[PDB]
Write a protein that binds this ligand. Structure first.
Ligand SMILES: Cc1nnc(CNCCN2C(=O)c3cccc4c(N(C)C)ccc(c34)C2=O)s1
Ligand SMILES: *[C@@H]1O[C@H](CO)[C@@H](O)[C@H](O)[C@H]1NC(C)=O
Ligand SMILES: *[C@@H]1O[C@H](CO)[C@@H](O)[C@H](O)[C@H]1NC(C)=O
Length: 572
């Protein structure tokens, strides 16, 4: 049948009213009301600069949208691909099984990339853009996106597509008539960590994830591609690692597959950043090399944080030949990344100390066998691995390490320096280490576990009860978690943040629900750093969830759809 309700704006809320026939006032459909009732309409993330959406909608012919690239250059391929995707983006405004009447104005989209040769990812990259929409002549619309680079341009196309609304009362595709928007992200690193070693993720699901990231302007996929449970990365130089280490022959990531993902990311402004976690979090794949110790050591609680145990043996020279080859194979296919993540989480002194070969090595260089001595062994390892990584990428590039015993701010400079190492933080946002590190000049990526660990909340995977970092983190808490507040005066040293999806209890099947729409909360926090709280973003968050579902993402459900249709009635 037909929609029988209409909506009217009342104190910032769209209230549902019967669409009575005896009225001379044109009915508003739900999302048409929302577009103007809400401070930022249906935008997500909201812009950081000018956000003028005017007051009117114009009817649009879906088949009369033309994108024109005004400046050519090295990014022609990327700009043309982005332009061709625009119609599909617009169509996301239209619910499945609905069709817009093909009437209304034609839309001219003009893309102006002021530096059409720039296509490298970097922390200094320019992601800003300007967006203007105005009527052109009597029967056309002029949308002009001006940006310093392809990446800013691509963000502009994303925002522009959000300015379309489907009127399901009249079956009209509508667009905001008068728009002036200027926009740029507060932080340059806006990421999602995907662990694909604790469980395998189909490359289809990885690309889908990238699609959703780009929809909310996240720009970094951190691919935690190995761990102790499996080695799915296909290293051509050390093929036994993936042959022995993969969960199955089909559960690998070939060079061809990785190149696909990396290119897919590039087209969508997403840096694909590989991680090789070391010297802990290794195991499967390394059998018969004699380059690990404690693999599957029992009882596991005595040797590691979670089973199976396993750590590299830094005392074996051959290890660094393996490492050099792995890093080199990674550099070959992950060839858009400007940064390399080297893990460095959770090293077990007990594990290293159960090894005879290791104990001899530490005696021979006159270190003892107490906790502080193994820090020296770890330092020895990281220095040699670091040198191999530089050689693999053919240049010095920033390296990332997790917060750990090694990166304790009190002695971190004994081991590292702030120019070469970025620290990924998974402590709570009030942990003293953060202030300590910032005072030493270190740059941080925020992944604080009390707000950014998306795996928390489910059943235990060892024994019973719930998993270690329960309770489940609602989007409200993700949204309110502010790096600016965490860092204070040292804000600029924060490169951004990253939602962590560890995969002990997640795989291809759960990935859409784990990430969405919660990662959108992080997307806005990192893009805009709003002074306002989640309550002020609530209505737009409910809409972005529906947009994800329309994209084919099996996003988590936040509230009854009744609440979405009846703003203001669901509160506490
Ligand atoms: C980087 C990494 N991110 N996540 C990783 C998984 N290993 C997590 C280990 N772990 C736990 O298993 C764990 C269990 C029970 C309580 C706690 C805890 N509290 C609330 C006292 C603080 C930190 C951890 C923890 C903690 O770090 S490595
Ligand atoms: C389209 O609008 C832009 C944005 O203001 C304006 O600069 C440009 O000249 C217009 N182009 C046309 C064809 O009107
Ligand atoms: C390592 O083991 C030796 C005993 O073989 C012990 O003396 C030393 O205390 C241990 N070190 C640590 C940190 O456990």
């Amino acid at each position: 049948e037909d929609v029988v309700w209409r909506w009217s704006c009342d104190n910032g809320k769209c209230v549902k009213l019967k669409n009575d026939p005896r009225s001379s006032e044109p009915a508003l459909s739900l999302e048409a009301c929302k577009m103007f009732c809400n401070e930022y309409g249906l935008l997500w993330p909201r812009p950081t600069g000018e956000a003028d959406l005017g007051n009117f909608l114009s009817k649009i012919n879906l088949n009369s949208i033309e994108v024109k690239i005004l400046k050519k250059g090295a990014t022609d391929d990327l700009m043309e691909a982005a332009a061709k995707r625009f119609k599909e983006q617009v169509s996301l405004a239209i619910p499945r099984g609905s069709t817009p009447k093909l009437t209304g104005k034609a839309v001219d989209v003009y893309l102006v990339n002021e530096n059409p040769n720039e296509k490298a990812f970097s922390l200094e990259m320019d992601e800003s853009y300007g967006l203007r929409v105005s009527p052109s002549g009597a029967d056309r619309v002029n949308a002009t996106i001006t940006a310093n680079s392809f990446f800013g341009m691509r963000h502009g196309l994303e925002t522009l597509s959000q300015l379309f609304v489907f009127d399901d009362i009249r079956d009209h595709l509508l667009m905001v008539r008068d728009v002036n928007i200027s926009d740029k992200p507060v932080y340059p690193y806006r990421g999602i960590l995907l662990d694909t070693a604790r469980n395998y993720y189909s490359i289809e699901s990885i690309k889908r994830t990238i699609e959703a990231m780009a929809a909310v302007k996240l720009n970094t996929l951190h691919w935690h591609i190995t761990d102790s449970q499996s080695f799915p990365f296909v290293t051509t130089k050390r093929p036994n690692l993936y042959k022995f280490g993969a969960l199955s022959p089909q559960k690998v990531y070939t060079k061809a597959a990785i190149r696909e993902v990396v290119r897919f990311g590039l087209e969508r402004g997403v840096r694909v950043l590989p991680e090789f976690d070391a010297p802990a979090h290794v195991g499967e794949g390394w059998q018969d090399t004699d380059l690990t110790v404690c693999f599957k050591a029992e009882p596991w609680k005595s040797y590691c944080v979670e089973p199976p145990c396993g750590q590299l043996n830094p005392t074996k020279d051959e290890l660094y030949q393996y490492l050099e080859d792995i890093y080199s194979d990674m550099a070959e296919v992950f060839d858009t990344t400007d940064i390399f993540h080297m893990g460095g989480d959770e090293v077990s002194e007990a594990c290293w100390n159960s090894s005879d070969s290791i104990q001899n090595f530490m005696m021979q260089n006159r270190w003892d066998l107490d906790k502080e001595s193994f820090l020296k062994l770890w330092n020895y390892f990281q220095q040699k691995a670091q040198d191999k990584a530089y050689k693999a990428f053919g240049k010095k590039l920033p390296l990332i390490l997790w917060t750990s015993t090694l990166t304790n701010y009190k002695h971190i400079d004994d081991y590292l320096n702030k120019d070469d190492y970025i620290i990924q933080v998974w402590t709570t946002g009030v942990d003293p280490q953060i202030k300590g590190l910032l005072e030493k000049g270190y740059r941080l990526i925020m992944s604080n576990y009390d707000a950014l660990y998306f795996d928390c909340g489910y059943g235990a995977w060892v024994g019973a009860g719930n998993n270690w970092c329960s309770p489940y983190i609602g989007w409200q808490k993700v949204y309110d978690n502010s790096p600016a507040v965490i860092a204070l005066e040292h804000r600029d040293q924060v490169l951004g943040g990253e939602a962590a999806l560890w995969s002990e209890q997640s795989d291809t099947s759960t990935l859409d629900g784990r990430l969405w729409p919660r990662a959108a909360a992080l997307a806005e926090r990192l893009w805009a750093e709003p002074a306002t709280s989640w309550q002020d973003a609530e209505y737009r968050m409910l809409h972005i969830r529906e947009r994800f579902v329309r994209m084919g993402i099996q996003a988590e459900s936040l509230q009854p759809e009744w609440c979405y249709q009846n703003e203001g009635y669901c509160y506490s």
